Amino acid sequence: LSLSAGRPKRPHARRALCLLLGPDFFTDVITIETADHARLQLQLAYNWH
Amino acid sequence: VRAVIGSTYMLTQDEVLWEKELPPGVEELLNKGQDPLADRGE
Numbered sequence: 001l002s003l004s005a006g007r008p009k010r011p012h013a014r015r016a017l018c019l020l021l022g023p024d025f026f027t028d029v030i031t032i033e034t035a036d037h038a039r040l041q042l043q044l045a046y047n048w049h
Numbered sequence: 050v051r052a053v054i055g056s057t058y059m060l061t062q063d064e065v066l067w068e069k070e071l072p073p074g075v076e077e078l079l080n081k082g083q084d085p086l087a088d089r090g091e
């Protein structure tokens with residue numbers, strides 16, 4: 001499995017062999033912009049299983 | 050010419066080995082790119 005990793009979540013950054021399907025999380029950095037044109041970046045955290 | 054696949058084989062009388070050539074670039078796809086689900090990145 002060729003997966004994604006890193007701080008802005010680049011692709012092809014962590015090759016692995018088994019699939020972990022547990023309640024982990026991964027964190028991403030999202031740059032967005034509002035209706036007032038305020039550019040601002042986020043840090044989120046994603047509980048998945 | 051045919052393909053004999055499976056068990057071990059001794060060439061009988063009047064049989065020789067044939068060479069299968071491939072179009073250019075196809076050998077580069079066979080040896081380099083092993084698993085296109087794996088290394089499809091490049």
Ligand SMILES: NC(=O)c1ccc[n+]([C@@H]2O[C@H](COP(=O)([O-])OP(=O)(O)OC[C@H]3O[C@@H](n4cnc5c(N)ncnc54)[C@H](O)[C@@H]3O)[C@@H](O)[C@H]2O)c1
Pocket residue numbers: 004005006014016017018019020021023024025026027028
């Ligand atoms: N329940 C929890 O809160 C919990 C449980 C286990 C681990 N964690 C840790 O939280 C950290 C969050 O950091 P991050 O996500 O910013 O780092 P990251 O973005 O580098 O992590 C990438 C994510 O991919 C997942 N992953 C990696 N190899 C895997 C495989 N073979 N199969 C399935 N999933 C795979 C990891 O769980 C990780 O969350 C992880 O490094 C993880 O070890 C949290």
